[PDB]
Ligand binder design. Structure first.
Ligand SMILES: Nc1ncnc2c1ncn2[C@@H]1O[C@H](COP(=O)(O)OP(=O)(O)OP(=O)(O)O)[C@@H](O)[C@H]1O
Ligand SMILES: Nc1ncnc2c1ncn2[C@@H]1O[C@H](COP(=O)(O)OP(=O)(O)OP(=O)(O)O)[C@@H](O)[C@H]1O
Lengths: 845, 845
């Protein structure tokens, strides 16, 4: 095809243009002509990929009117080629400024009136005074503008620290530094003739600092703003390990650098609601107090700063200028975020840009994507990761899976402290993450204005929904509320690649506005509408040939139709169905890029037997029917890592007709990559109690098991103990039935978490070696339990136990177990941080 | 079809050129060739956005032979613009090279030490403030407009015998627009020790610590931070200033009030020279020791008044008078052209100082500040009229949550805080009401906006500058005419590129009937018509063809109804019809105005039928008929913040006796954004006076109320006390009827200003619970009041009560309150700064 030829020439220009965008993004350009040049080529690049993906889809449909649509694509390619040719000619003067080719400003912090750091300084000073006799690093970690340097300078000037450490050196490390000037700066603290070392190498300069520091007692060295582990390695030569309890206090935005200097870094606190108000009040009114007319909007101002001292200091600058009237302060309270970033591009914007610009080029889009969700809202890590892959941000072709590559992208953001973690799974994996309010405003301002990554759709007080001229340039739409009325305007976005319904309350699509999304946005790759209840599938949903992510709630539909299989590019499938049976009639076995099938009903998979391929990318098959756990299905998914079965566990374990007792559970053991297995039972009216198949038929690589309502006997825990890799066991809704549970010796070699909900169990007995690696034990709503085994005190890995609706004798046994554990720790064993939690606290007085 | 595509091609070029102008305006280089390139590109850009706007209104009107001809004309005009764009790139390639690429001044200014006139009192005021104060480091920022004499006063303060005697060490520091903090610290160190060579490897952190040590060797220090421009610049320098509790002082000079407020919440705004002192300086600078000859004394005082007490203007004209010789005729010629000598012919001294504040202004604030020069010199600019003009011209670009009025008001606050715009009047709440630009800045605005950027051009008939011809009108962008409007309009002017027509005159003129349609005929692309100084006897069909109109203000004595064809101007934001008629009936389809923001009139406006769509941008409806305050009208306007009612308001407060509670006043309570409400009565022949509806019917977010001739009994004032957020209440004559005024306990929880005029009040009883926040209480022409309640003296927040020609008992009560308050202050009670003013001094003294 000649269209392929002009596409290939277009791709060559795209490689140059993308190289220009990457090169221009490596350093922030202050020239407006280059700013508009970057935006112009960034746009023509975006329309270029959208045009080629149209040709790719149309060529795929051609290989597997049609001619008129292909002709229209060719016309788009010709128009794009005319655009790139004029860019290379008219704007060539701007390209030459990027095809071919610094001030050290140490920060200034508060000396007097430091608010809320009285106990953080006390904690860190205690860690500086005590410890080993070797040079120990005490890192203070935090997000941009948290107050690390303010705390470090508070410690540096503390009366106890000054007396403790005879020699105190403050060194300003930064993103860029020269080791020679660092050593000469430290040398200048001690001797005035620094011209003495003009030709002395850095090797002997470091030994010179060794001599200066070792002449007295301890030394404390505050390495401010360390950004890399290489910087600490290169500078630490000057610091001798002469066994004098020497300390190196360090401040950094990087948790990975902090961990390598000390395995327990000191994460700095956020100011409380009263400390934020106290700080803002002091900054604005100085010694005087806030008049009562301004206290009400002022308190809201300090609470909207989310306890970040940088935001409170920046906002107080605007309040000082505006005045002391009530009306002005409510205007600020309604636009706290804008005052931080847009109105102040020199305090908050430049401080955040110090971390954003140091990001890798691929991680920048991942970080800005977190701003699509509402400010202060919890972002599920699994949801965020699946959106990154579906958007194309995760480009990777190594041995690992894309989930594990996007996960350490997120863990890199958390290490950089650009993303905060609110909940962690039992295995330590990130579960729920949230971006700070000012960083979120930076994500909004950068993505919507500077990069056109995504756009908010709203009609607030005065602003309205975007017009036809704006939607023609929009690439991603994120919307929280008023979705049905937004779609009632009949919008038309030709360049829209994603539609994120980030609203928290589930809405219902009217039957007339159900097909609005597929027609408004024909190039939709991502449709995150799990907060929307669709009652019907419309045929236009099956014309989204570019679709890769689709999440949707439903209350009525039961079957995914066969026309849904026309979307060969789909990766993630989330259908939160209120019903009980979800017959997936779509040909999901021909989606070579399919990765996840998540649902809550009993999904019935289509027939695998009859392209001659295998679903090598499919990783999750959650809550499918037990009838579909066939041998052919598990052959089609060699790389499955999570499996879920719901309903009729009776048919999962029943023996076959060939005489062998191994049932459908035997095929599950053939999944060599399986880590998570979930079994949920529904048929309480069945006359046959369920019996667990022997452990040699289980998947031997299973690391997490969840059972609900299965009515297994407690004697089957003995064969759950034979699993070599099981680490998390959660049992809910009397999944185990019986009044007595007596453990056999041994078993559970590496189980770490045991979660128990309501069951008719009354007695529990065990031996010393039953839980060699148990760390967390939880028991909820089991009012029939009499007592807990005393052998739990021998669990060396025990850290926390939670009991609800438990007997007082169980609390007494917990007290004895804790007391024995404390006695063991007093023999030299390190403390495990034992904790006990009984909810509600009003129970038992 | 392809014409719209060609508009996209032109728009792409316009984005590049607009960025070119934005980047070029960031650096005023000496390259003259680039100065002519930016002027040529700017003219093409202006002629391009005009052609694009012509295309926009043509497309809107179309969606027929005349339309086809106009479309062909637009296509030809666009083609000419495109061809002009190609000439820019073909010939001025080098000019674009200089801006897409990138790349002595720290000499302290000279100020006279001797012959300083008019600063004896101001210096003593600041000295008495430096000597006193607290025990920690206090800053005393002197702040004023460019050329005011801050450095002259600061050097005078720096050299008095009292300042020199009291302070241990005094240091002069010249901070500037751009400075290096390292050099400042090395200069302070250079004064204590001359061996500054030894700090080459010493970082700025240890330099600031060295300045701490040097200043801390003794007692007080006074440091004159000259010309500080930023909040950050003060923070980075104050780290070198020790705080040892010895009453250390810092004397800062700055053009920024917001920077001054941060250092001290009570900035010392420098005063302007009086008319006597201005003449004294001029005669001392021109004639030196010799006195002015008597023949030159009369013109000399005339030019001294032209400077408006600014020393910089006096110094500049002094050089002009020296060069121009000493003759009476020449001096009178200078007095007629003072502005020319300030800026046009002396760019060496005056213009550069003005440009220091101007080039630091953000790009959006530059056009906002230059627009303030359109109004006549010394004239008073209303703040609400100025703000609406900025929005109409497009200078305010905003997408956040605030309203465009609040953003533009913040722009006005930024200009005032930069001392580029004076504030002459302030509202009760402290909002800026009337502003005026200083004379030197007005001439700079006119020079920059006529001879450099072509923002606006004035029309006048002087000695040599007659009315401009057709060639000059072909380049005029905005028209500003003060007088001789009918004479200018009689010649049938033809300005096809005029975007504004500001009648900046003060006295109203009646437009001759035969010249009424001349304004719309002359400038078809009129975007702003500020004809509020012109009385129109009739509307014309030519007015309804100004499809680009956004701001329209006009006075009238004959027009009673706005015609329906007025609604053809869908772009209108502000609609002002100041009519002397009793009623105004708006037949125009104002609901179709999607961007309508303000409708203001003095008559009882009768709104048209609303018959889904919502006017989200409408903020003000001003005075309307009571019968039009329906729940349907308020549905279409949810963001209304000011409402006015005029006429027979008994149709508003009447009870719906049919059985429902749907009184027209109850619909007002459904407006959640209302903040100010006005009611004016016209009909007095009701059998009984009206009574207020219950307070829960009032809008809860109401913060200001105003009633006229409503004849409300004083008993129904306590219900106004149940308004939670009310802050200002004002009443004109006969708004309240009766002689006895009594209040319940509590009420008025947030009242701050109360206004009463010419009521029948004679007896007044109140309680301390009704005034928790009251600050202003005026009783103009309420001479029948006997005595003020004693509870008023207990109100801490009370500020001023002003009465003239009051009763003898009222004067005696004022004397008793003043005497008792003075006695209490002498006994240790904290003073509230309460003042009483009596004019003239013949009575009451
Ligand atoms: N407890 C506090 N009281 C008053 N001001 C504070 C406090 N903590 C921080 N600040 C102010 O907040 C701003 C940012 O704090 P700080 O300089 O310590 O940032 P940081 O966490 O070191 O920043 P970076 O991310 O650049 O390393 C500074 O202007 C500082 O004065
Ligand atoms: N009271 C005065 N008597 C005589 N000359 C004065 C007086 N005040 C100021 N001047 C003169 O006015 C001119 C400008 O004043 P000055 O240099 O003090 O300006 P400024 O307020 O510091 O301005 P900028 O905002 O540019 O810093 C100088 O030449 C100075 O000598």
């Amino acid at each position: 095809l000649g269209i392929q030829g002009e596409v290939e020439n277009l791709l060559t220009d795209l490689n140059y243009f993308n190289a220009f965008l990457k090169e221009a993004a490596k350093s922030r350009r202050e020239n407006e002509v280059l700013k508009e040049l970057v935006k112009k080529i960034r746009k023509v690049v975006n329309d270029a990929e959208d045009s080629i993906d149209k040709f790719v889809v149309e060529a795929k449909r051609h290989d597997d009117t049609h001619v008129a649509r292909a002709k229209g694509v060719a016309d788009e390619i010709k128009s794009i080629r005319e655009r790139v040719k004029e860019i290379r000619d008219n704007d060539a003067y701007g390209l030459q400024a990027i095809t071919l080719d610094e001030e050290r400003k140490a920060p200034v912090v508060e000396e007097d009136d430091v608010v809320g750091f009285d106990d953080e300084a006390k904690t860190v000073i205690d860690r500086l005074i005590g410890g080993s006799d070797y040079v120990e690093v005490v890192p203070v970690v935090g997000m941009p503008g948290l107050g690390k340097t303010t705390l470090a300078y508070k410690i540096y000037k503390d009366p106890k620290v000054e007396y403790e450490f005879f020699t105190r050196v403050w060194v300003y490390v930064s993103q860029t530094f020269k080791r020679r000037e660092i050593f000469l700066n430290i040398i200048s603290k001690f001797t005035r003739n620094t011209k003495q070392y003009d030709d002395t190498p850095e090797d002997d300069l470091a030994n010179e600092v060794k001599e200066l520091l070792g002449k007295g007692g301890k030394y404390l060295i505050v390495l401010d703003d360390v950004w890399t582990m290489e910087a600490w390695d290169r500078i630490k030569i000057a610091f001798p390990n002469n066994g004098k309890r020497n300390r190196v206090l360090m401040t950094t935005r990087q948790s990975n650098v902090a961990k390598r200097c000390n395995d327990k870094p000191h994460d700095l606190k956020f100011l409380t609601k009263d400390e934020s108000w106290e700080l803002l009040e002091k900054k604005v009114f100085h010694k005087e107090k806030c008049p009562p007319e301004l206290e009400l909007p002022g308190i809201s101002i300090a609470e909207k700063c989310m306890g970040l001292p940088l935001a409170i200091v920046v906002i107080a600058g605007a309040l000082i200028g505006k005045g002391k009237t009530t009306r002005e302060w409510e205007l600020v309270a309604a636009s706290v975020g804008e005052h931080l970033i847009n109105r102040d591009p020199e305090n908050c914007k430049k401080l955040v840009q110090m971390s954003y610009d140091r990001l890798p080029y691929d991680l920048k889009a991942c970080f800005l994507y977190c701003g699509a969700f509402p400010g202060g809202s919890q972002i599920p890590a699994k949801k965020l990761i699946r959106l990154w892959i579906a958007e194309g941000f995760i480009q990777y072709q190594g041995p690992l899976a894309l989930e594990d590559v996007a996960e350490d992208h997120l863990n890199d953001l958390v290490n950089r402290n650009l993303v905060m973690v609110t909940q962690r799974s039992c295995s330590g994996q990130i579960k729920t993450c949230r971006v700070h309010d000012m960083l979120h405003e930076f994500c909004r301002h950068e993505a919507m204005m500077e990069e056109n990554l995504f756009q908010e759709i709203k009609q607030g007080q005065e602003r309205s929904f975007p017009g036809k001229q704006e939607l023609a340039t929009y690439r991603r739409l994120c919307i929280q509320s008023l979705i049905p009325e937004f779609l009632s305007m009949k919008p038309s976005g030709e360049h829209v690649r994603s539609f994120l319904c980030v609203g928290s309350k589930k809405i219902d699509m009217p039957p007339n506005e159900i097909p609005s999304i597929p027609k408004a946005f024909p190039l939709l790759r991502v449709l995150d509408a799990e907060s929307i209840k669709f009652s019907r599938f419309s045929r236009e949903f099956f014309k989204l040939f570019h679709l890769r992510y689709i999440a949707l709630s439903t209350d009525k539909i039961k079957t995914i139709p066969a026309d849904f299989g026309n979307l060969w590019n789909i990766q993630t499938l989330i259908v939160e169905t209120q019903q009980a049976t979800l017959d997936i009639k779509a040909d999901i076995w021909n989606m070579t890029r399919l990765r996840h099938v998540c649902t809550n009903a009993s999904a019935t998979l289509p027939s695998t037997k009859r392209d001659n391929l295998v679903n090598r990318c499919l990783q999750t098959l959650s809550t499918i029917a037990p009838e579909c756990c066939t041998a052919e299905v598990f052959t089609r998914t060699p790389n499955l890592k999570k499996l879920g079965v719901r309903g009729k566990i009776d048919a999962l374990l029943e023996s076959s007709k060939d005489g062998s007792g191994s049932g459908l559970f035997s095929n599950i053991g053939k999944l060599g990559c399986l880590e998570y297995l979930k079994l949920v039972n529904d048929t309480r009216l069945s006359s046959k109690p369920l019996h667990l198949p022997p452990a040699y038929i289980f998947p031997q690589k299973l690391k997490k098991l969840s059972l609900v309502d299965t009515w297994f006997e407690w004697k089957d825990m003995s064969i759950l103990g034979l699993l070599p890799e099981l680490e998390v066991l959660k049992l809910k809704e009397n999944a185990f039935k019986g009044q007595s549970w007596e453990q056999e010796d041994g078993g559970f070699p590496r189980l770490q978490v045991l979660w128990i909900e309501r069951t008719d169990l009354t007695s529990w007995k065990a031996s010393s070696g039953n839980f060699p690696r148990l760390k967390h034990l939880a028991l909820i709503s089991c009012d029939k339990l009499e007592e807990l085994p005393a052998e739990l005190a021998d669990v060396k890995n025990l850290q926390l136990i939670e009991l609800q609706s438990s007997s007082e004798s169980a609390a007494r046994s917990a007290r004895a177990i804790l007391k024995r554990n404390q006695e063991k720790e007093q023999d030299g064993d390190k403390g495990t941080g034992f904790k006990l939690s009984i909810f509600p606290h009003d129970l038992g007085l």
